[PDB]
Every structure is written in C-alpha cells, then in structure tokens.
Design a binder for this molecule. Structure first.
Ligand SMILES: CC(=O)N[C@@H](CS)C(=O)N[C@H]1[C@@H](O[C@@H]2[C@H](O)[C@H](O)[C@@H](O)[C@H](O)[C@H]2O)O[C@H](CO)[C@@H](O)[C@@H]1O
Ligand SMILES: CC(=O)N[C@@H](CS)C(=O)N[C@H]1[C@@H](O[C@@H]2[C@H](O)[C@H](O)[C@@H](O)[C@H](O)[C@H]2O)O[C@H](CO)[C@@H](O)[C@@H]1O
Ligand SMILES: [Zn+2]
Ligand SMILES: [Zn+2]
Ligand SMILES: [Zn+2]
Ligand SMILES: [Zn+2]
Lengths: 167, 167
C-alpha cells in the first residue's frame, strides 16, 4: 500500500537529477558563473543551492549526516561560506562566492540523489505523516517537507534552464 | 491507504497555485509581456503555458473537458492562437501573442487548480498505475504523467519568478 507514494517521490526526485544532467552537460566555467544582473543567481548557485536544500532536508528527516560533510564535498568545493550554508537568504556578495566546476556540481547532486533514493525506498504512510521538529513554527509533516524540497528544487532547476537560454 | 499519495499530489499542486498568486501581484502588462531577450519567454507566456499544460493533461487523464474551453477562458483571453494551443513548440513570434491581464492569467490557473484537486480527490493506487501512453518507452502511467506536470509547471513558474527579479 506504500508503493504508490514511494513511486511518486522516486519519480519526482529523479526528474530533478535528470535536469542536473541536462544543465551540466557541456557547462563551462563562464556560463556556470554568469549572472544577468549583479543580484541575480547563476547556474552554479542554482545547482549548488538545490543540492544543498535537498541534502540538508532529506538528511534531516532520514536522521543521517548530510552528504556535503559525510563525503567531504564541502571541502572539495572550498566555498568562502559557512560550512552548512545552503544559500537560503544569500545576498549578492554571497552568490558570487559559489564557484565550482560542473563535474563537482553534478557529483554532489548525484550523491544527494543516492541518499534521497535510499530514504524513499523505506517510505511508509506512517513516516509521511510523522511531524518534523524545526525552528519554523509551525512544524510540518515529512510529506510536506518532501513536497517543499521538490517544489524549491524544480523551480531553481527551471531557472537554471532559462538562464542557459537568455545568456 | 490512498490518502498518502492523494496528499502528496494535493500539496504539490497547491504550491503551484500559490506561486501563481505571488507572480501576479503587481504584474503590469509591461512586466507580464517583458522578454529579457527577443526570443525569451515572458511571464505571461510562462503563466499561461503552465496552466494550459496542467489543464490539458489533467483533463485527459481524468476524462473530462479542459476548463480552458468548458468555462470559456479561451474566449475571455481572445489570443490569436489555435483554440487548444498550449505553447509547446512555440516560436518567438508565437510567444509574443500570449498577452492577457494578470487577473485573467490568475483566474484561469485557479480554475485549472480546482479541476486538478477534483481529480486528485478520487485518486487510487490502481489509477496511479494505469497506462496512459503505451507507445512511449517506458510506458507512461498516470503517476508519471502527473509528476511530469508538476515538474514542468514548477520549472516554468520558477522561471517566471526569476524573470520578475531581473526585469
Ligand atoms: C524558488 C525560490 O525562490 N525558493 C526560495 C527558498 S530556498 C529561495 O531560494 N530564495 C533565494 C533566492 O531568491 C531569489 C530572489 O528572490 C530573486 O529576486 C527572485 O527573482 C528569484 O526567483 C528567487 O529565487 O536567491 C537569493 C539569493 O540570490 C536568496 O536570498 C533567496 O533566499
Ligand atoms: C521546462 C521546459 O522547458 N518544458 C518544455 C516542455 S512543455 C517547454 O516548455 N519548452 C518550451 C519552452 O522552451 C524554452 C526554450 O527551450 C529556452 O531556450 C529555454 O531556456 C527554456 O528553459 C525553455 O523552457 O519555450 C519555447 C517557446 O519560447 C517552446 O518552443 C518550448 O516548447
Ligand atoms: Zn558543523
Ligand atoms: Zn531555494
Ligand atoms: Zn479545437
Ligand atoms: Zn513547458
């Protein structure tokens, strides 16, 4: 009885990592860092921020360590940003710090996707209704948190696709 | 036992209509029709196309009429485009034909949202596994079709929010 919700989640998150593959395909350093205005986000920022949001929030509900630190991606990126920064609330001067090659942007997201698939494989209705304690009143259910991740990441991955065109 | 999958879908589609409300606040015709480059999509196009894709694809799987025609939104818009056009495959000159006030862009999407929630409210595991395209490889199920809609619409609504910020 849990297969239907598991499949919806697996498919939705798969669409995200598929987009990462399209966006990083042939993605150069210049194009990845391009910003149409000094306050706009770059492709590199959108890929990094999406992966961070998914990693930190999936790891939170799964009760495990984020891939970012567990496998040393934070050190491979070497960003001049706090160690657990996700990009939420960044100012333009923070956006400019997000500099990483396409293969690192893709490798990190693929590791986040593997973590995500592992968590979804054990999804139950009971887990989807579990309340998740966060600092943001109100708490939310696992289901709402997962939907929030897909919605945020799909929006940003869409923005990155639009950027590749308008550049 | 269908509640969990119904809730994932209800929540995901609700996020989309919330984005529509944010995007149409303060959306003048100059802003709605703005294209950052001569060929780029406008906010109006992104709102209209997202609603059209969701309407036509949900109406198809649900076996009901699209609200675009059922309630005469197509006539209120009065676009110089075919009656059933969704914008898929539009050329730059076709994108320019999508012009409508924010109130109509929002009103149509809200009608599409209502239709979508009505279909979700009856959704079952058996329906989610029903094959809607036997010719594709792999064959397309209702579940995958719905995920495709959320993913396309979330991407485009994200693009619209990005454009609003760079205008
Ligand atoms: C889909 C989405 O927007 N999700 C949220 C939640 S995680 C988000 O990511 N906000 C960050 C994003 O804001 C962007 C900013 O507002 C632009 O003006 C707007 O045109 C974009 O559309 C919007 O993305 O980048 C900023 C740094 O440049 C950060 O300060 C923001 O926190
Ligand atoms: C998220 C997504 O792209 N979904 C597809 C399937 S529905 C879609 O909407 N394609 C239409 C879209 O293409 C855009 C175009 O390629 C840009 O270069 C790219 O930068 C954008 O990201 C992309 O959206 O606008 C065109 C009219 O301007 C139409 O010809 C296309 O059919
Ligand atoms: Zn720490
Ligand atoms: Zn975000
Ligand atoms: Zn017709
Ligand atoms: Zn589309």
């Amino acid at each position: 009885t849990d297969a239907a919700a598991q499949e919806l989640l697996r498919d939705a998150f798969t669409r995200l990592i598929e987009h990462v593959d399209e966006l990083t395909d042939g993605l150069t350093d210049q194009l990845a860092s391009y910003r149409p205005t000094p306050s706009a986000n770059s492709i590199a920022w959108l890929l990094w921020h999406s992966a961070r949001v998914q990693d930190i929030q999936v790891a939170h509900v799964a009760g495990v360590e984020e891939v970012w630190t567990r496998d040393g991606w934070v050190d491979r990126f070497g960003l001049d940003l706090p160690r657990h920064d996700t990009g939420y609330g960044h100012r333009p001067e923070d956006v400019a710090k997000v500099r990483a090659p396409a293969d690192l942007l893709s490798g990190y997201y693929h590791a986040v996707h593997k973590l995500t698939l592992e968590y979804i494989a054990g999804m139950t209705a009971d887990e989807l209704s579990r309340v998740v304690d966060t600092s943001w009143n109100p708490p939310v259910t696992v289901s709402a948190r997962l939907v929030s991740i897909v919605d945020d990441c799909a929006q940003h991955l869409g923005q990155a696709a639009y950027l590749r065109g308008i550049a």
